[PDB]
From TrEMBL, chain B:
Protein name as it appears in the record: Terpene synthase
Taxonomic source organism: Hypoxylon sp. E7406B
Recorded name of the encoding gene: Hyp3
């Protein structure tokens, strides 16, 4: 299991659900014994590691092939270049920690693909604030990704390119949100769904047509909401310090809640954390309702993969050095 | 007509005709009167401007859309510098315009812009041979619009650029003193960016030819590739030799090969290559006579004629370029 640098929780409050989450039990069982779809993961209870774990998910799963992902990300970094080292170390650390936690089902080859893809996204995201050589590097990445999976790879790469196009567009500084639900709809747009959905299909080694995705859409919206709001909660402090120095806008659910509810910032964080707890229960309810419907094994595996992204995202954020001690 | 900074001839002997050439007559008629396929080009006698014109070709054609190409090449350079000594950039913009406007004179205003950007991408890579997603987008945006401008010709045009990039990588590290001139000619022909130049002719001439359409013109194509490459050798020799004395750089040039094989002076080797080039032009004219007797598609005939315009354009560009001079 990958070493943990730091652990933090912005809010500081943990909880326990009124009723057992049978639907999440597979994560807990995976810690002790092999469970379907988790053969490639180390599954652990973060509380045993000392990491604050204020969530309904009983465990977090991490791909056991993170060491390969580090080599892959480092290899790609050497091609691209062909306190700066400190920035590079953070880039490589984030490029591994995020996909290894969010998409833990990854085997060794697909983990390498995920880490390279994560590096490319994170390098572009940092940049926001000879072309043929550079175009060749990406083309080699597409070839290796396409070879590992002929079916999902093209969507996987298209998901990367769709994300770069969204980054270009900027929400207006003037624009404000009247309702939290309105903020959620905007914030959901920030998530790279096409990549993350393909990344689940890739790491879980399953294929779903877009029509197979229509039944899972309510769970999918729940997973995007939980992922996005979790990212806002853990990143809030990093944004405010950036706001003070560079005058950064702070587009964060915490700030929206503070304005809409007219409460303290500390209370806004508590409300967001609780909103996330209710989302986790809503995710659990949808899973129960979905089990009633005749679902395909791949559809169910995707439904479960979305749950693993949410839990892994919490673990990634809680152990992330950018967010802790900003 | 595009301003010329410099004019030079490495050898200095002029051509004198014993037999007038009917096939090359269309270039001459184009100066005084509009000729089919030259509606987009200014056709001139380079001697009238004061440029030395040591060739059987009666005229050179240069696109009337060069100013647009300068606009396009300047735009592409600005995107590239943003996504990332000044003397190299300005020279690069100059070579990126002068070469395609002279080599592919038929280009209209939109296709002239395409050629200048494509040429800029090729030249910058060649200098290099001597974040990533943002660079990739720049090429993808170039690839789009090229395909929109010409949906049929666009794919091989862009593929021709990529095929060249790979070939540059597949380049022998050193070439042994050539035992044979025919052997040297074959190696030079292999380097020729054939896929791109054939597509650039199709693009600029606004005609399309299948591979089967190209089978009749193959002897002319080989002559054109040879004349193009040997012309480049002749005019670049002074550039290569002076560099070779300063850096002990290897020289791979027809001038040096003949001087070695005939054991002759440099002045005589240059005269020998100049005459070999005139004999190639005579063979080009002879093949043009033979082709006319054979039934030929009008597009095929436009391609045969486009190859001649590349040869004459290359001569004018080579004499015009400052780097070949000084």
């Amino acid at each position: 299991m990958r070493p943990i640098t730091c652990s933090f929780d912005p809010v500081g409050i943990s909880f326990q659900t009124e009723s057992k989450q049978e639907n999440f039990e597979f994560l807990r069982e995976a810690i002790s014994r092999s469970v379907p779809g988790l053969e490639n993961c180390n599954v652990f209870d973060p509380r045993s590691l000392g990491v604050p774990w204020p969530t309904s998910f009983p465990a977090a799963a991490q791909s056991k092939y993170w060491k390969d992902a580090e080599e892959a990300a480092a290899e790609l970094m050497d091609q691209i270049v062909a306190k700066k080292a400190a920035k590079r170390r953070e880039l490589l650390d984030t490029s591994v920690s995020a996909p290894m936690n969010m998409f833990p089902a990854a085997n060794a080859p697909r983990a390498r693909i995920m880490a390279k893809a994560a590096l490319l996204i994170f390098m572009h995201d940092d940049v926001c604030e000879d072309i043929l050589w550079q175009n060749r590097i990406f083309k080699e990445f597409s070839e290796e990704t396409n070879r590992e999976d002929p079916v999902v790879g093209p969507q996987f790469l298209q998901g990367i390119l769709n994300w770069v196009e969204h980054t270009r567009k900027a929400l207006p500084a003037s624009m404000t949100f009247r309702s939290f639900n309105e903020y959620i709809d905007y914030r959901i747009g920030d998530f790279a769904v096409d990549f993350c959905d393909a990344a689940i299909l890739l790491t879980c080694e399953i294929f779903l047509t877009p029509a197979d995705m229509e039944p899972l859409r309510k769970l999918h919206r729940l997973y995007m909401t939980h992922f996005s709001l979790t990212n806002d909660l853990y990143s809030f402090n990093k944004e405010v310090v950036a706001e003070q120095e560079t005058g950064s806008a702070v587009i964060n659910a915490v700030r929206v809640l503070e304005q809409l509810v007219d409460t303290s910032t500390r209370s806004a964080k508590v409300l967001l954390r609780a909103f996330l707890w209710d989302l986790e229960l809503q995710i659990h309810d949808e899973l129960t309702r979905l089990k009633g419907t005749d679902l395909t094994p791949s559809q169910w595996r995707f439904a479960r993969g979305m749950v693993e992204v949410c839990a892994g995202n919490i673990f990634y954020s809680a152990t992330c050095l950018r967010y802790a001690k900003p």
